[PDB]
DNA sequence: CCACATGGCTGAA
DNA sequence: GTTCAGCGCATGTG
C-alpha cells in the first residue's frame with residue numbers, strides 16, 4: 001500500500017521541496033524518490049548533496065567531462081578555468097554524486113524530451129518575473145515551456161508529470177506582471193493542466209517569518225478526473241503564531257553590534273506582527289535600519305543585502321541571526337545545517353545566501369499534504 | 377498630494 | 390574573476 005512518489009525539482013536549490021516531501025512521507029504512506037533535478041549553482045549542489053545524501057563519502061575526484069554548465073555565483077556560467085579549479089578536488093565529488101545519484105541535469109537549457117524522466121509524480125519549478133515578457137515568454141520559463149511542449153509530443157499523457165508546483169515572489173501578481181502570469185496559466189491549460197494560484201505567508205504555517213510567496217499548483221486533467229482531487233483553500237489557513245525567540249540558539253560567543261552612536265525609539269508592532277525599531281543616522285537604506293524584537297515575527301530572509309543581515313535585540317545585545325538560525329528560519333533542521341557546515345566548502349554568507357533563496361519547508365508540507373494519488 | 381509598510385544590486389578592493 | 394558593505398525605490402494600502 002506504500003506509494004512511490006517520483007519527484008523532479010527544477011531550480012532545486014537546497015531541496016526544500018524534497019525536504020518537505022520526506023517530512024510528510026510517513027504520514028501519507030509515501031516513499032519519496034529522486035526522479036531528477038536541475039540545479040547549476042555549485043554551492044547549492046554541494047549543500048543539496050550534504051543535506052539529502054545517505055552514505056555519501058566525499059573524496060578527491062576528476063569532474064565528469066560533461067559537467068560543463070555550472071555556476072559559482074548562481075547568475076553567470078563558470079569559465080573553463082573555474083572548471084579546471086574544481087577538477088581534482090573533494091568538491092568535484094559532490095557534483096559527480098549529484099549527477100549520478102540524484103540525476104542532476106544541471107542546466108535547464110540542456111533538459112529535453114530525451115533526458116526528462118517519464119511518469120513524474122511531482123514536478124517543481126520557478127522563474128523570474130521578467131521571463132513573462134519577450135526580452136511569448138523568455139529565459140527560464142521559455143525553457144520550461146519548451147520542455148513541456150517537447151514531452152507533450154513524445155510522451156503518452158499518462159507519462160507526463162501528474163502535479164506541477166511553481167513557487168515565486170509576491171510581485172508575480174503585480175499590475176505589470178499579473179496578466180502575463182495569467183497567460184502562462186492559459187499555456188498550462190493547453191498542456192493539459194488545471195491550476196490554482198495561492199498567495200501564502202510563512203507566518204501562517206508555523207513560522208516566525210513574514211514571507212509572502214505565490215504558488216501555482218497544477219494537476220494533470222485526466223489525473224484530476226481519476227483521483228477526484230479537489231484544491232484546498234490554503235489561503236484561509238492560520239496556524240498558531242511562532243516568535244523569533246522560539247528558534248534562537250543559546251551561545252556564549254556571539255558577536256554583538258556596537259550601536260551606541262545611533263539614536264532609536266520604542267518598538268512598534270505593525271499589522272503583520274513584525275515588531276521593530278529604527279536606528280537613526282545608521283544608513284540611507286531603509287531596510288538596513290531596523291532592529292527586530294524577538295517576541296514577534298521577523299522580516300523576509302533574503303539571499304543578500306539588508307534582509308540577509310537580520311538584527312535582533314537580545315538580553316546580551318543586538319546581533320545578526322546566525323547561519324544556523326537562518327536555516328531554522330526557513331524550517332530546515334539543525335542536522336541539515338550541520339551537514340552543510342561539515343562539508344567545509346560553504347562560507348557563512350553563502351549558507352545564508354542559499355537559505356534565503358529557499359522556501360519555508362512547512363508551507364510546502366501543507367501544499368503537498370493536499371495531493372492525491374491512485375493506488376495503482 | 378500624504379503616511380505607512382515592506383522587500384536585491386554592484387563597484388572598490 | 391570574487392566578495393560584501395554600502396546603498397533606495399518599487400509597489401503597493403489606506
Ligand SMILES: C[S@@+](CC[C@H](N)C(=O)[O-])C[C@H]1O[C@@H](n2cnc3c(N)ncnc32)[C@H](O)[C@@H]1O
Nearest residue numbers: 011012013014015016039040041074107108358
Ligand atoms: C530561488 S532558487 C530556488 C531555491 C529552491 N527552491 C530551494 O528549495 O532551495 C532559484 C535557483 O535556480 C538556479 N538556476 C538559475 N539558473 C539556472 C539554470 N540555467 N539551470 C539550473 N538552475 C538555475 C539558481 O542557481 C537557484 O538555486
